[PDB]
Amino acid sequence: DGALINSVLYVSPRNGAHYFVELTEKHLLAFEMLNSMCLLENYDHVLLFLECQFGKSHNLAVIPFDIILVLFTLSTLSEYYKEPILRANDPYNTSRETLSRRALKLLQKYLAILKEFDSEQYNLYDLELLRCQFFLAIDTLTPKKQKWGKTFKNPYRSYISCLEQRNTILGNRLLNLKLNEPGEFINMILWTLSNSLQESTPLFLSSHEIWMPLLEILIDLFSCRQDYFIQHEVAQNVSKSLFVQRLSESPLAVFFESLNTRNFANRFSEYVFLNCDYKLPSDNYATPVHPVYNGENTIVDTYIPTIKCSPLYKSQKSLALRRKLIGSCFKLLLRVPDGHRLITPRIVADDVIQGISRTLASFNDILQFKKFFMTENLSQESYFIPLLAEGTLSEILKDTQECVVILTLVENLSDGVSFCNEVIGLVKSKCFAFTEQCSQASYEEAVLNIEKCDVCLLVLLRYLLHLIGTEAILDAKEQLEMLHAIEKNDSGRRQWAKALNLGNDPPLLYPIVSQMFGVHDKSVIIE
Amino acid sequence: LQDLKKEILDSPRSITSNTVAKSELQKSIKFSGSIPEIYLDVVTKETIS
């Protein structure tokens, strides 16, 4: 794909790592200086060294993997519960920023630099060395075997690492050491996902400021490592049996091995949407969550929380993180050959799709459903979002209507005419239309199901427009008939609206389709 | 001595390092919460940065 996964010109493959890159004299001197400054606990000078030459020169300063781990540990030292320790470490805050914030900003900026390889902006050797350092950090961040609830290796022999003699930065254990525990990585994921929507100020501060960004960085780095593993670690041509074994050893396979539980589908669906609006089905057992670093749930008296975030902002961030986790899971699942299944992780794509569809259909709040199904970039999440939308629509039709119409819209995305014909067939069956069986007492629940079904159809229509564009909306009679059928469905909803059961107008997708590809309600408002 | 004592009684008989600054910061705080005194003390006693 990109230059990030296909640049092996300066690499020196070794038994431990295939991405290993040798250090030059200038890089060796920089590594030694950073390690020496880290040894004296002068983190402020380390951050100044990294920031002073960032973006001001053609050459790139490569952060060593041990320094990357030190920055990851610093990111956990948030001001709200560690203000006295940070003030003691740096009495004169020359930067006027928290050490945790500066470390997180540097990590995010370096991740952004790593994501796109600009050969013109930066020399290829520096980019490859940075990729090697990040991959070494990810390899040191390998999760331990899941628990329901070897110290340090330096590949470079040129310099002595600072982490060899120390396991803690400022009273907090190193992130790699903390995560390399049987019950910590899954615990951390559950803690951040639970605290993402928490109203409590300490819990909200713990995730929003610390765990949410670190988890996003880890997911992106694991995705890049998975791409590198698939591109080079594999043997290319294969008998389709060894490839499954190699995929079982892939970094994403180890990442999701710590979340295998007993049944991956149901437990994973509960974990990703933990503490969401959906009602918990089958009285699932509560999942224990504890703070990772001492008192993450406590706020020091010195710190004063002066920041308020709206519930929509928190929901948007939480659903984006959930989408990233589901996308990583589907990216790992899509590589599995048809028929064969992974040995180490008991993961099935159909089971995950069904579990996510069950969780989405159980949502009682439309806002979270829309946040999950609305994405800024369709191409980035094109591989799993249409499948989830189709599954949710199928389940909604199954519960609302006694007759379950098989949906082939995902394969019909290739041909617009087939998609429009299938939509006409579904609306003719009245499964898409409001169901007369639903009682007036439960009208609000029926409207809640209908709006979610409309959201799923809108997502599928957006993907169809992304795949085919706007070329035969009126030229082909099938699309015009589909728009007429949408108008007929709108008239069916208007029949219940004229029934005057409730003042609120039933949700109509006709304006949204008109904005997207309805050409201004056809002839209704073209004038 | 009695008249001198009467004027002496008029005179007041029988730290505040940052009391005024801390008090003024407390009055203009724009915050509905606890606002612990330790935060005011650490904010008003920097003297270096």
Coordinates of C-alpha atoms in Angstrom, one line a residue:
Chain A
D1 CA 0.0 0.0 0.0
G2 CA 1.8 3.2 1.3
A3 CA 5.5 3.8 1.7
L4 CA 5.1 3.2 5.5
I5 CA 4.7 -0.6 4.9
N6 CA 6.9 -1.0 1.8
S7 CA 10.1 0.8 2.8
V8 CA 12.9 -1.8 3.6
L9 CA 15.9 -0.1 1.9
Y10 CA 17.8 0.8 5.1
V11 CA 16.5 -2.1 7.3
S12 CA 18.8 -4.7 8.8
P13 CA 16.6 -7.7 9.6
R14 CA 17.5 -9.7 12.8
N15 CA 16.1 -12.7 14.6
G16 CA 14.3 -10.5 17.2
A17 CA 12.9 -8.0 14.6
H18 CA 12.8 -7.8 10.7
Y19 CA 12.4 -4.0 10.8
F20 CA 15.7 -3.4 12.8
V21 CA 17.6 -0.3 11.5
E22 CA 21.3 0.4 12.4
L23 CA 22.1 3.8 14.1
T24 CA 24.3 6.5 12.5
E25 CA 26.8 8.5 14.6
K26 CA 24.4 11.6 14.9
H27 CA 21.5 9.3 15.9
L28 CA 23.7 7.4 18.4
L29 CA 24.7 10.7 20.0
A30 CA 21.1 11.8 20.2
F31 CA 20.1 8.5 21.7
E32 CA 22.9 8.7 24.3
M33 CA 22.0 12.3 25.2
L34 CA 18.3 11.4 25.7
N35 CA 19.1 8.4 27.8
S36 CA 21.6 10.5 29.9
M37 CA 18.9 13.2 30.5
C38 CA 16.3 10.5 31.3
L39 CA 18.7 9.0 33.9
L40 CA 18.9 12.3 35.8
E41 CA 15.1 12.5 35.9
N42 CA 15.4 15.7 33.8
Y43 CA 12.2 14.9 31.7
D44 CA 11.6 18.6 31.0
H45 CA 15.0 18.8 29.1
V46 CA 14.0 15.6 27.3
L47 CA 10.7 17.2 26.1
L48 CA 12.6 20.4 25.3
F49 CA 15.1 18.4 23.2
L50 CA 12.3 16.7 21.3
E51 CA 10.3 19.9 20.8
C52 CA 13.1 22.4 19.9
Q53 CA 14.0 20.6 16.6
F54 CA 10.5 19.4 15.8
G55 CA 9.3 20.8 12.3
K56 CA 12.1 23.4 12.2
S57 CA 14.5 21.4 10.0
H58 CA 14.5 19.0 7.1
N59 CA 16.1 16.2 9.2
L60 CA 14.0 14.3 11.8
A61 CA 15.1 13.6 15.4
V62 CA 14.2 9.9 16.1
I63 CA 12.8 9.1 19.5
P64 CA 14.4 5.9 20.9
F65 CA 12.0 3.1 21.9
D66 CA 12.9 3.3 25.6
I67 CA 12.2 7.1 25.4
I68 CA 8.9 6.2 23.7
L69 CA 8.1 4.0 26.7
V70 CA 9.1 6.8 29.1
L71 CA 6.8 9.2 27.3
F72 CA 4.0 6.6 27.5
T73 CA 4.5 6.3 31.2
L74 CA 4.7 10.1 31.5
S75 CA 1.3 10.3 29.7
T76 CA -0.3 8.4 32.6
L77 CA 1.0 11.0 35.2
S78 CA -2.0 13.4 34.7
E79 CA -2.1 16.7 36.7
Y80 CA -5.5 16.1 38.3
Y81 CA -4.2 13.3 40.6
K82 CA -0.4 13.9 40.4
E83 CA -0.1 17.7 40.6
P84 CA 2.2 17.8 43.7
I85 CA 4.6 15.2 42.2
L86 CA 4.8 17.1 38.9
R87 CA 5.2 20.4 40.7
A88 CA 8.1 18.9 42.8
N89 CA 9.8 17.5 39.7
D90 CA 9.5 20.8 37.8
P91 CA 9.1 23.7 40.2
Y92 CA 9.7 26.2 37.4
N93 CA 7.2 25.2 34.7
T94 CA 9.0 27.1 31.8
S95 CA 6.8 25.3 29.2
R96 CA 3.6 26.2 31.2
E97 CA 2.3 22.7 30.2
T98 CA 1.9 19.4 32.1
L99 CA 4.7 16.9 31.4
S100 CA 2.0 14.3 30.7
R101 CA 0.4 16.7 28.2
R102 CA 3.7 17.5 26.5
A103 CA 4.6 13.8 26.2
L104 CA 1.1 12.9 24.8
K105 CA 1.4 15.8 22.3
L106 CA 4.9 14.6 21.2
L107 CA 3.6 11.0 20.9
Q108 CA 0.6 12.0 18.8
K109 CA 2.7 14.3 16.5
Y110 CA 5.3 11.5 15.9
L111 CA 2.5 9.0 15.3
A112 CA 1.1 11.4 12.7
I113 CA 4.6 11.7 11.1
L114 CA 4.9 7.9 11.0
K115 CA 1.4 7.4 9.5
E116 CA 2.4 9.2 6.2
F117 CA 6.0 8.9 4.9
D118 CA 7.0 12.2 3.4
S119 CA 10.2 11.3 1.6
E120 CA 10.5 15.0 0.4
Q121 CA 9.8 16.4 4.0
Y122 CA 12.0 13.9 5.8
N123 CA 14.8 11.5 4.7
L124 CA 13.8 7.9 4.3
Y125 CA 16.4 6.6 6.8
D126 CA 15.0 8.7 9.7
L127 CA 11.5 7.6 8.9
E128 CA 12.5 3.9 8.8
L129 CA 14.4 4.4 12.1
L130 CA 11.3 6.0 13.7
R131 CA 9.2 3.1 12.4
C132 CA 11.7 0.6 13.9
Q133 CA 11.6 2.4 17.3
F134 CA 7.8 2.4 17.3
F135 CA 7.6 -1.3 16.3
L136 CA 10.1 -2.2 19.0
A137 CA 8.0 -0.2 21.6
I138 CA 4.8 -2.1 20.4
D139 CA 6.7 -5.5 20.7
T140 CA 7.7 -4.5 24.2
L141 CA 4.0 -3.6 24.8
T142 CA 2.8 -7.2 24.0
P143 CA -0.2 -8.0 26.2
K144 CA 0.0 -11.0 28.6
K145 CA -2.4 -14.0 28.6
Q146 CA -6.0 -12.8 29.5
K147 CA -7.0 -13.2 33.2
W148 CA -10.8 -12.9 33.9
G149 CA -10.0 -11.2 37.3
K150 CA 12.4 -10.8 30.4
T151 CA 12.6 -7.5 32.3
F152 CA 14.2 -5.4 29.5
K153 CA 15.9 -6.2 26.2
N154 CA 17.9 -3.6 24.3
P155 CA 18.5 -4.5 20.6
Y156 CA 21.1 -1.7 20.2
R157 CA 24.4 -2.6 21.8
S158 CA 25.9 0.9 21.0
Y159 CA 24.4 2.6 24.1
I160 CA 23.1 1.6 27.6
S161 CA 19.4 2.2 27.9
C162 CA 18.0 4.2 30.9
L163 CA 15.2 1.6 31.5
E164 CA 17.7 -1.2 32.3
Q165 CA 18.3 0.2 35.9
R166 CA 14.8 1.7 36.6
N167 CA 11.2 0.3 36.5
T168 CA 9.4 3.6 37.6
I169 CA 9.5 7.2 36.3
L170 CA 7.8 9.3 39.0
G171 CA 6.3 6.7 41.4
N172 CA 4.4 5.1 38.5
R173 CA 5.5 1.7 37.0
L174 CA 6.5 1.7 33.3
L175 CA 3.4 1.3 31.0
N176 CA 5.0 -1.8 29.2
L177 CA 5.6 -3.5 32.6
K178 CA 2.1 -2.6 33.9
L179 CA 0.3 -3.8 30.7
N180 CA 2.5 -7.0 30.6
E181 CA 0.3 -8.4 33.4
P182 CA -2.4 -11.1 33.1
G183 CA -5.4 -8.9 34.1
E184 CA -4.3 -5.3 33.2
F185 CA -4.6 -4.7 29.4
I186 CA -8.3 -5.8 29.2
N187 CA -8.9 -4.1 32.5
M188 CA -7.4 -0.8 31.0
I189 CA -9.7 -1.1 27.9
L190 CA -12.8 -1.8 30.1
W191 CA -11.8 1.1 32.4
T192 CA -11.4 3.6 29.6
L193 CA -14.6 2.4 27.8
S194 CA -16.6 2.6 31.1
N195 CA -15.2 6.0 32.1
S196 CA -15.7 7.5 28.5
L197 CA -19.4 8.0 29.2
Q198 CA -19.1 8.4 33.0
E199 CA -20.5 11.7 34.5
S200 CA -18.2 11.5 37.5
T201 CA -15.5 14.2 37.2
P202 CA -12.5 12.0 38.3
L203 CA -13.4 9.0 36.1
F204 CA -14.2 11.3 33.1
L205 CA -10.8 13.1 33.6
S206 CA -9.0 9.7 33.9
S207 CA -10.0 8.5 30.4
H208 CA -10.7 11.7 28.4
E209 CA -7.2 13.1 29.3
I210 CA -5.1 9.9 29.6
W211 CA -6.5 6.5 28.5
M212 CA -8.6 7.6 25.4
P213 CA -5.6 9.2 23.5
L214 CA -3.1 6.4 24.6
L215 CA -5.6 3.7 23.5
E216 CA -6.0 5.5 20.1
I217 CA -2.2 5.7 19.6
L218 CA -1.9 2.0 20.6
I219 CA -4.6 0.9 18.1
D220 CA -3.0 2.9 15.3
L221 CA 0.5 1.5 16.1
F222 CA -0.9 -2.1 16.3
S223 CA -2.7 -1.5 12.9
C224 CA 0.6 -0.4 11.3
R225 CA 2.5 -3.3 12.9
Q226 CA -0.2 -5.7 11.6
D227 CA 0.2 -4.2 8.1
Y228 CA 4.0 -4.7 8.3
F229 CA 3.6 -8.3 9.6
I230 CA 1.2 -9.1 6.7
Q231 CA 3.5 -7.4 4.1
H232 CA 6.9 -9.0 5.1
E233 CA 6.7 -11.6 8.0
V234 CA 4.4 -13.8 5.8
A235 CA 5.8 -16.2 3.2
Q236 CA 3.8 -14.7 0.2
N237 CA 2.6 -17.8 -1.7
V238 CA 1.1 -20.3 0.9
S239 CA -1.0 -23.5 1.1
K240 CA -3.7 -21.4 3.0
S241 CA -2.9 -23.4 6.2
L242 CA 0.5 -21.9 7.3
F243 CA -1.0 -18.4 6.6
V244 CA -3.7 -19.0 9.2
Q245 CA -1.0 -20.1 11.7
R246 CA 1.0 -16.9 10.9
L247 CA -2.2 -14.8 11.3
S248 CA -2.7 -16.4 14.7
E249 CA 0.9 -15.1 15.6
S250 CA 0.0 -11.6 14.1
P251 CA 0.2 -8.5 16.5
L252 CA -3.6 -8.0 16.3
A253 CA -4.2 -11.7 17.1
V254 CA -2.2 -11.3 20.3
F255 CA -4.0 -7.9 20.9
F256 CA -7.4 -9.6 20.8
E257 CA -6.2 -12.8 22.5
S258 CA -6.2 -10.8 25.8
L259 CA -10.0 -10.2 25.1
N260 CA -10.9 -13.8 24.1
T261 CA -12.9 -14.5 27.3
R262 CA -15.2 -17.7 27.1
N263 CA -17.4 -16.7 24.1
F264 CA -15.7 -14.0 22.0
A265 CA -18.8 -12.7 20.3
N266 CA -21.1 -11.9 23.2
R267 CA -18.4 -10.8 25.6
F268 CA -16.7 -8.6 23.0
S269 CA -20.0 -7.0 22.1
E270 CA -20.6 -6.2 25.8
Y271 CA -17.0 -5.0 26.2
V272 CA -17.0 -2.6 23.2
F273 CA -20.4 -1.0 24.1
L274 CA -19.8 -1.2 27.9
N275 CA -21.9 1.4 29.9
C276 CA -23.9 2.4 26.8
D277 CA -27.6 3.2 26.4
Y278 CA -28.6 -0.4 25.3
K279 CA -30.4 -2.5 27.9
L280 CA -28.2 -5.4 29.2
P281 CA -29.5 -8.7 27.7
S282 CA -29.7 -12.0 29.7
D283 CA -28.5 -10.2 32.9
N284 CA -24.8 -10.5 31.8
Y285 CA -22.3 -10.6 34.8
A286 CA -20.9 -7.1 35.7
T287 CA -17.3 -6.6 34.6
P288 CA -14.9 -5.6 37.4
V289 CA -13.0 -2.3 36.7
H290 CA -10.2 -0.7 38.9
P291 CA -7.9 2.3 38.4
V292 CA -4.6 1.2 36.7
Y293 CA -2.2 3.7 38.4
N294 CA -3.0 4.1 42.2
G295 CA -5.7 6.8 42.7
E296 CA -6.8 7.5 39.1
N297 CA -10.4 7.9 40.6
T298 CA -9.3 10.6 43.0
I299 CA -8.6 14.3 42.3
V300 CA -5.9 16.1 44.3
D301 CA -7.1 19.2 46.3
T302 CA -4.5 21.5 44.4
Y303 CA -6.0 20.7 41.0
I304 CA -9.3 22.5 40.2
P305 CA -11.3 21.0 37.3
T306 CA -12.4 24.0 35.2
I307 CA -13.4 22.1 32.0
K308 CA -16.9 20.9 31.1
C309 CA -17.6 18.6 28.1
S310 CA -21.1 18.2 26.7
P311 CA -22.6 14.7 26.7
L312 CA -22.7 14.7 22.8
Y313 CA -18.9 15.4 22.7
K314 CA -18.2 12.5 25.2
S315 CA -20.6 10.2 23.3
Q316 CA -18.9 11.1 19.9
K317 CA -15.4 10.4 21.3
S318 CA -16.5 7.1 23.0
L319 CA -18.3 5.9 19.8
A320 CA -15.3 6.8 17.7
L321 CA -13.0 4.8 20.0
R322 CA -15.5 1.9 19.8
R323 CA -15.6 2.2 16.0
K324 CA -11.7 2.1 16.0
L325 CA -11.7 -1.1 18.1
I326 CA -14.4 -2.8 15.9
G327 CA -12.5 -1.7 12.8
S328 CA -9.2 -3.3 14.1
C329 CA -11.2 -6.5 15.0
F330 CA -12.7 -6.6 11.4
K331 CA -9.3 -5.8 9.9
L332 CA -7.8 -8.9 11.7
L333 CA -10.9 -11.0 10.7
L334 CA -10.9 -10.1 7.0
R335 CA -7.4 -11.6 6.5
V336 CA -8.6 -15.1 7.6
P337 CA -9.0 -17.4 4.5
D338 CA -12.6 -18.5 3.7
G339 CA -13.5 -21.9 5.4
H340 CA -10.5 -21.9 7.7
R341 CA -10.6 -20.2 11.1
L342 CA -7.8 -18.8 13.5
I343 CA -6.6 -21.3 16.1
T344 CA -5.3 -19.2 19.0
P345 CA -8.2 -16.6 18.8
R346 CA -11.7 -18.1 18.7
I347 CA -13.0 -15.3 16.5
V348 CA -15.7 -15.6 13.8
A349 CA -16.7 -12.6 11.5
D350 CA -20.4 -13.7 11.4
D351 CA -20.5 -14.1 15.2
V352 CA -19.0 -10.6 15.7
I353 CA -21.4 -9.1 13.1
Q354 CA -24.4 -10.7 14.8
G355 CA -23.3 -9.5 18.3
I356 CA -22.7 -5.9 17.2
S357 CA -26.1 -5.9 15.3
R358 CA -27.8 -7.2 18.5
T359 CA -26.1 -4.5 20.6
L360 CA -26.9 -1.7 18.1
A361 CA -30.6 -2.9 17.7
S362 CA -30.9 -2.8 21.6
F363 CA -30.0 0.9 21.7
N364 CA -32.8 3.0 23.2
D365 CA -31.1 6.4 22.4
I366 CA -30.9 7.4 18.7
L367 CA -28.0 9.9 19.3
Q368 CA -25.5 7.1 20.2
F369 CA -26.7 5.0 17.2
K370 CA -26.2 8.0 14.9
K371 CA -22.8 8.8 16.4
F372 CA -21.7 5.1 15.8
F373 CA -23.1 5.2 12.2
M374 CA -21.9 8.6 11.2
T375 CA -18.2 8.8 10.1
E376 CA -16.2 11.8 8.7
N377 CA -14.4 9.4 6.1
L378 CA -16.4 6.6 4.4
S379 CA -13.3 5.1 2.7
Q380 CA -11.5 4.6 6.0
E381 CA -14.3 2.5 7.6
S382 CA -15.7 1.0 4.3
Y383 CA -14.7 -2.6 5.2
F384 CA -16.9 -3.3 8.3
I385 CA -19.5 -0.4 8.7
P386 CA -21.8 -1.6 5.7
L387 CA -21.8 -5.2 7.2
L388 CA -22.8 -3.9 10.7
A389 CA -25.5 -1.6 9.1
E390 CA -26.9 -4.6 7.0
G391 CA -26.9 -6.8 10.1
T392 CA -28.6 -4.2 12.3
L393 CA -31.2 -3.6 9.6
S394 CA -31.8 -7.4 9.2
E395 CA -32.3 -7.8 13.0
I396 CA -34.6 -4.7 13.2
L397 CA -36.8 -6.2 10.3
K398 CA -36.7 -9.6 12.1
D399 CA -38.0 -8.2 15.4
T400 CA -40.5 -5.7 13.8
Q401 CA -41.8 -8.0 11.1
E402 CA -42.7 -11.8 11.5
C403 CA -41.3 -12.3 7.9
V404 CA -37.5 -11.9 7.6
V405 CA -36.5 -10.7 4.1
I406 CA -32.9 -11.8 3.3
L407 CA -30.8 -8.7 2.6
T408 CA -28.1 -8.8 -0.1
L409 CA -27.5 -5.0 -0.2
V410 CA -23.7 -5.3 0.6
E411 CA -23.1 -7.4 -2.6
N412 CA -25.7 -5.1 -4.4
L413 CA -23.5 -2.0 -3.6
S414 CA -21.6 -2.8 -6.8
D415 CA -24.8 -2.3 -9.0
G416 CA -27.1 0.6 -8.1
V417 CA -30.0 -0.9 -10.1
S418 CA -29.9 -4.1 -8.0
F419 CA -29.7 -2.1 -4.8
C420 CA -32.7 0.1 -5.8
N421 CA -34.7 -3.1 -6.9
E422 CA -33.9 -4.7 -3.5
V423 CA -35.0 -1.5 -1.7
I424 CA -38.3 -1.4 -3.7
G425 CA -38.8 -5.1 -2.7
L426 CA -38.2 -4.4 1.0
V427 CA -40.5 -1.3 1.0
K428 CA -43.3 -3.2 -0.9
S429 CA -43.2 -5.9 1.8
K430 CA -43.9 -3.0 4.4
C431 CA -40.9 -4.2 6.5
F432 CA -39.3 -0.8 5.9
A433 CA -42.7 1.0 6.4
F434 CA -44.2 1.5 9.9
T435 CA -45.8 -1.7 11.1
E436 CA -49.6 -1.6 11.8
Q437 CA -49.2 -4.5 14.3
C438 CA -47.4 -2.2 16.8
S439 CA -49.9 -0.8 19.4
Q440 CA -50.5 2.9 20.0
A441 CA -49.1 2.5 23.6
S442 CA -45.7 1.2 22.2
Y443 CA -45.7 3.8 19.4
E444 CA -42.5 5.5 20.7
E445 CA -40.5 2.2 20.7
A446 CA -41.7 1.4 17.1
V447 CA -40.6 5.0 16.1
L448 CA -37.2 4.3 17.8
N449 CA -36.8 1.0 15.8
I450 CA -37.9 2.8 12.5
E451 CA -35.4 5.7 12.9
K452 CA -32.6 3.2 13.5
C453 CA -33.7 1.2 10.4
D454 CA -33.7 4.5 8.5
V455 CA -30.2 5.3 9.7
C456 CA -29.0 1.9 8.5
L457 CA -30.6 2.4 5.1
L458 CA -29.0 5.9 4.9
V459 CA -25.5 4.5 5.7
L460 CA -26.0 1.8 2.9
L461 CA -27.2 4.5 0.5
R462 CA -24.1 6.7 1.3
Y463 CA -21.8 3.6 0.7
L464 CA -23.7 3.0 -2.6
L465 CA -23.1 6.7 -3.6
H466 CA -19.4 6.2 -2.6
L467 CA -19.2 3.1 -4.8
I468 CA -21.3 4.2 -7.9
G469 CA -21.6 8.1 -7.6
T470 CA -24.5 10.0 -9.1
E471 CA -24.8 9.1 -12.8
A472 CA -28.3 7.4 -13.4
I473 CA -30.5 8.6 -10.5
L474 CA -33.3 9.6 -13.0
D475 CA -31.8 8.2 -16.3
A476 CA -32.5 4.6 -15.0
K477 CA -36.2 4.1 -14.3
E478 CA -35.3 1.7 -11.4
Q479 CA -33.8 4.5 -9.2
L480 CA -36.8 6.8 -10.1
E481 CA -39.2 4.0 -9.0
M482 CA -37.1 3.5 -5.8
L483 CA -37.5 7.3 -5.1
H484 CA -41.3 6.9 -5.8
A485 CA -41.4 3.9 -3.4
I486 CA -39.6 6.1 -0.8
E487 CA -42.4 8.8 -1.3
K488 CA -45.0 6.0 -0.9
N489 CA -43.3 4.9 2.4
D490 CA -43.3 8.6 3.5
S491 CA -47.1 8.6 2.7
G492 CA -47.5 5.4 4.8
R493 CA -45.7 7.2 7.8
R494 CA -47.9 10.3 7.1
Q495 CA -51.0 8.1 7.5
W496 CA -49.9 7.4 11.2
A497 CA -48.9 11.1 11.5
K498 CA -52.6 12.0 10.5
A499 CA -53.7 9.4 13.1
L500 CA -52.5 12.0 15.6
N501 CA -51.3 9.4 18.2
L502 CA -48.5 11.8 19.3
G503 CA -47.7 15.4 18.4
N504 CA -44.1 14.6 17.3
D505 CA -43.9 13.9 13.5
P506 CA -42.7 10.4 12.7
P507 CA -39.1 10.5 11.3
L508 CA -39.1 10.8 7.4
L509 CA -35.9 10.0 5.4
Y510 CA -37.3 11.7 2.2
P511 CA -35.5 15.1 2.9
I512 CA -32.2 13.3 3.7
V513 CA -32.4 11.2 0.5
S514 CA -33.3 14.4 -1.4
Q515 CA -30.2 16.1 0.0
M516 CA -28.0 13.1 -0.8
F517 CA -29.3 11.9 -4.2
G518 CA -33.1 12.6 -4.3
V519 CA -32.4 15.7 -6.6
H520 CA -34.5 18.0 -4.4
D521 CA -37.5 15.7 -3.8
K522 CA -37.6 14.8 -7.5
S523 CA -40.1 17.3 -9.1
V524 CA -41.7 18.1 -5.7
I525 CA -39.3 21.0 -4.9
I526 CA -37.0 21.1 -8.0
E527 CA -38.9 24.3 -8.7
Chain B
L1 CA -1.7 59.3 83.8
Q2 CA -5.5 58.7 83.6
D3 CA -6.0 61.1 80.6
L4 CA -2.8 59.6 78.9
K5 CA -4.3 56.1 79.5
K6 CA -7.6 57.3 77.9
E7 CA -5.7 58.3 74.7
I8 CA -3.8 55.0 75.1
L9 CA -7.1 53.0 75.3
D10 CA -8.0 54.8 72.0
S11 CA -4.9 53.1 70.5
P12 CA -5.5 49.3 69.7
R13 CA -4.3 47.1 72.5
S14 CA -3.6 43.3 72.5
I15 CA 1.4 36.7 59.8
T16 CA -0.9 37.9 56.9
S17 CA 2.0 37.2 54.4
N18 CA -0.5 36.6 51.5
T19 CA -3.9 37.0 53.1
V20 CA -5.0 40.0 50.9
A21 CA -3.9 38.3 47.6
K22 CA -5.4 35.0 48.6
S23 CA -8.7 36.7 49.7
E24 CA -8.9 38.7 46.4
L25 CA -8.3 35.6 44.4
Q26 CA -11.0 33.8 46.4
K27 CA -13.6 36.6 45.9
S28 CA -13.1 36.7 42.0
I29 CA -13.1 32.9 41.4
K30 CA -16.0 32.4 38.9
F31 CA -16.3 28.8 40.2
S32 CA -19.2 27.0 42.0
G33 CA -17.3 24.3 44.0
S34 CA -15.1 23.5 47.0
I35 CA -12.1 25.7 46.0
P36 CA -9.8 24.2 48.8
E37 CA -7.5 26.7 50.6
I38 CA -4.4 24.6 49.6
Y39 CA -5.0 25.6 46.0
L40 CA -5.2 29.3 46.9
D41 CA -2.1 28.9 49.1
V42 CA 0.0 27.2 46.3
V43 CA -1.2 29.7 43.6
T44 CA -0.5 32.8 45.7
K45 CA 2.9 31.7 47.1
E46 CA 4.9 31.0 43.9
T47 CA 7.4 33.9 44.3
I48 CA 9.7 32.4 41.6
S49 CA 7.7 31.6 38.4

